[PDB]
Design a protein around this nucleic acid. Structure first.
Ligand code: CL
Ligand code: CL
Ligand code: MG
Ligand code: MG
Ligand code: NA
Ligand code: NA
Ligand code: NA
Length: 326
DNA sequence: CCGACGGCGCATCAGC
DNA sequence: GCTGATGCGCC
DNA sequence: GTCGG
């Protein structure tokens, strides 16, 4: 973290733009700049030096000059002192509360953890669970725990049907020493891009994980995506493990490579790669890579037999998962 | 100057 | 009920 | 807020 002061500053600005200003393109701009600076292998000495990096422009270079000179940003100092901004930023830390809900809550005079707790009747299901586990969800998961969670999920899935394949993705697959949550990509040969030969494929797995008390709560659930809460079992006399966020995504089996590319991330890596694809005349989602016709309409799915094939189409050298932590 | 900036699953709601 | 818009989530 | 043309 050679430039941690700068990247922290840009991340704080990004969050302000998303949560308070509701300016998603500014949010993405700040996060892109923070990411490119984070990988830069020199301690930055000026805004001009930073401006040479793709995604850092005139305004950010100016802020970098102020930050290097003084160790702070007047713009952020004022934001920190603003009650409405402060309140909104806090409330959005609850899962299920976004910029819109946060501002609405603050309008009604709900602006603290205490306020939320006394007004549960005003929260939807997702928000209620987000509140319940507020503390737990801001804790990171040690890789050692991720390995224990992996073993439980892979073994329980196998007990349901030996034909399932579950792959842990997200930061775990990128080799991180800690993760924010657990991301599980699921396949089964009965669900392909061509047909669904069995119903309840995701349901049966969620059900089994609930039965063994691994999954503890549900935030949202459909045919292909589960979003919930899980917890490792603790031993006799042992303090309980924190509750953790878990996401499970069932992807058509024949579209595994596009799926695992998506679910491995990072999010900024995906945005950067998908934007590069567009410049190259392709569109990538979690299912397919397609060409863009002269008009602008996506054409038919191209053959993909590896993650690398996707990189090849857009003329990028392959990057291993561990090198996608942007 | 100015349009584009990644792509999509699930929850909730308005209009019919 | 359905459809489309919008919020919020995921990488 | 930044980039590309
Ligand atoms: Cl914006
Ligand atoms: Cl598709
Ligand atoms: Mg994750
Ligand atoms: Mg994430
Ligand atoms: Na630049
Ligand atoms: Na939130
Ligand atoms: Na996740």
């Amino acid at each position: 973290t050679l430039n941690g002061g700068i990247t922290d500053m840009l991340t704080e600005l990004a969050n302000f733009e998303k949560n308070v200003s509701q300016a998603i393109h500014k949010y993405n701009a700040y996060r892109k700049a923070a990411s490119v600076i984070a990988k830069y292998p020199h301690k930055i000495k000026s805004g001009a030096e930073a401006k040479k990096l793709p995604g850092v422009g005139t305004k950010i270079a100016e802020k970098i000059d102020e930050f290097l000179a003084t160790g702070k940003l007047r713009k952020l100092e004022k934001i920190r002192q603003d009650d409405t901004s402060s309140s909104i930023n806090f409330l959005t830390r609850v899962s299920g509360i976004g910029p819109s809900a946060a501002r609405k809550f603050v309008d009604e005079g709900i602006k603290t953890l205490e306020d939320l707790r006394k007004n549960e009747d005003k929260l939807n299901h997702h928000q209620r669970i987000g509140l319940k586990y507020f503390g737990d969800f801001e804790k990171r998961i040690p890789r050692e725990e991720m390995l224990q969670m992996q073993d439980i999920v892979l073994n329980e899935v196998k007990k349901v049907d030996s034909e399932y394949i579950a792959t842990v993705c997200g930061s775990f697959r990128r080799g991180a020493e800690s993760s924010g949550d657990m991301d599980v990509l699921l396949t089964h040969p009965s669900f392909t891009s061509e047909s669904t030969k069995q119903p309840k494929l995701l349901h049966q797995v969620v059900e089994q994980l609930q039965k063994v008390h691994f999954i503890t709560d549900t935030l949202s659930k459909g045919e292909t995506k589960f979003m919930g809460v899980c917890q490792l079992p603790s031993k006799n006399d042992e303090k309980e493990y924190p509750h953790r966020r878990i996401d499970i995504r069932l992807i058509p089996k024949d579209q595994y490579y596009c799926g695992v590319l998506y679910f491995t991330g990072s999010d900024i890596f995906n945005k950067n790669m998908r934007a590069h694809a567009l410049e190259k005349g392709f569109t990538i989602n979690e299912y397919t890579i397609r060409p863009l016709g002269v008009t602008g309409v996506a054409g038919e799915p191209l053959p993909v037999d590896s993650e690398k094939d996707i990189f090849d189409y857009i003329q990028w050298k392959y990057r291993e998962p561990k090198d996608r932590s942007e």
